[PDB]
C-alpha cells in the first residue's frame, strides 16, 4: 500500500505498469524519495550503474572530505554547469559529481593557471554533454523494443548498460590521448 | 650534428645545438630529430603514447581480431590520418588500438551507424578540449627569454606530472555527464 503514494494520479494500464516498475526499483535499492523526484523513474537503476549512489553533498562537505579549496571548487562546479544552488551549504551535488570537481585543484598545485583550468573544465564539459546525448540515443535505440513495458525497458537497460560501463572509461581516456598526440604532431 | 642543424645560423643554431644534444641523450634518434620540425616536443610525445610506431588498419584488425570494415569507419570518424588504404602504414599504433575498441560496443547490440556517429561527436569535442589544454600548458612552460632547451625540459617535467591526472579526470567527467543525460 506504500507504492500508492508513488503511483499518484496514474490510471489504467499505465498505473499497473508503473506499479511493477516501482516494485522492481525499490528492490534495486532505489528510494521512494528518488522515485518521487524523477519523472519518469524508468532508468533510475541505470543511473546508479553510472555512479549515482543515492547520496548528496554540499560544496563545503566536498572541500572538507578531499581537502581542497572551497572557492576554487565552486568555480569548477559553475564551469561544469550541472548544479543550480550556489550556496556552499546546499546539499545538492551527487557525491560522485563532488569527487570529480575536486580533481581540479591538483592541476593548479602543479602550476597551471586557475583561470585557464576553469576554462578547460567548461570546454571539456560542453564537448562531453554532446557526446553523452548521442550515447543516450544510441543506448535507447538498443533498449526500446516495440511493445516493451516500463519494467521490460528497465531490466533490459540494467543488463545492457552493466556490460557497457567497464568499456566506457578506458575508451574516453584513449580518445583524449589520441587528441593530445595530434596536437603535438 | 651539423646535418641536424641545417641552415640555422647565429643564436638559433646555438640553441638548436643544445636541444639536439639533450634529445640524443634522452634516446631520440638523429632520424627522428631530422623528421620533426621543430624537434622541441620529441621527448614529450612518448608521455602521451606516441612512440613513433605506425600500423596499417589491416594489421590492427589481425592483431586485435576486429572487423576491418568497421575499424576503417571508426578511423574516418576520428579523421586524423590522411588515409584510406587498409594496407597503408599511416596510423599511430596507439590510435589504432583506440579504434579497435568500437567492435565490442557493436557486438553488444549497439547500431554501428550510431556508434560511428558517437565517435565523430566525441572526437570533435575532445579536439577543442585538447586545444585549450595546449594553451594552458604553454602558459605554464613559456618564460620570458626561454631557450628551446629550457622549453623542452620544462615541457617534459610538467607533462610527466600532469599525464597521470588526465585519464582519471576525463573518465570522471564523462560519467558525470551520463548521470545527468
Ligand atoms: C570507439 C568509441 C565507441 C563509442 C561507444 C558508444 C557508447 C554507447 C553508449 C553508452 C551508453 C551509456 C548510457 C548510460 C545511461 C544513463 C542513463 C541514466 O543516467 O539514467
Ligand atoms: C576538469 C578539471 C580541470 C583539469 C583541466 C586539465 C588541464 C590540462 C592542461 C595541460 C595538460 C596537457 C598536456 C599536453 C599539453 C602539450 C604540452 C606542450 O605544449 O608541448
Curated annotation (Swiss-Prot), chain B:
Highest taxon listed in the record's lineage: Bacteria
Region feature (Regulatory domain): 1-179
Family to which the UniProt record says this protein belongs: Belongs to the adenylyl cyclase class-4/guanylyl cyclase family.
Subunit structure: Homodimer.
Function: Catalyzes the formation of the second messenger cAMP.
Name of the molecule in the record: pH-sensitive adenylate cyclase MT1302
Organism for this UniProt entry: Mycobacterium tuberculosis (strain CDC 1551 / Oshkosh)
Lineage, highest ranks first: Bacteria, Bacillati, Actinomycetota, Actinomycetes, Mycobacteriales
Part of the intact protein present: 13 to 193 of 397
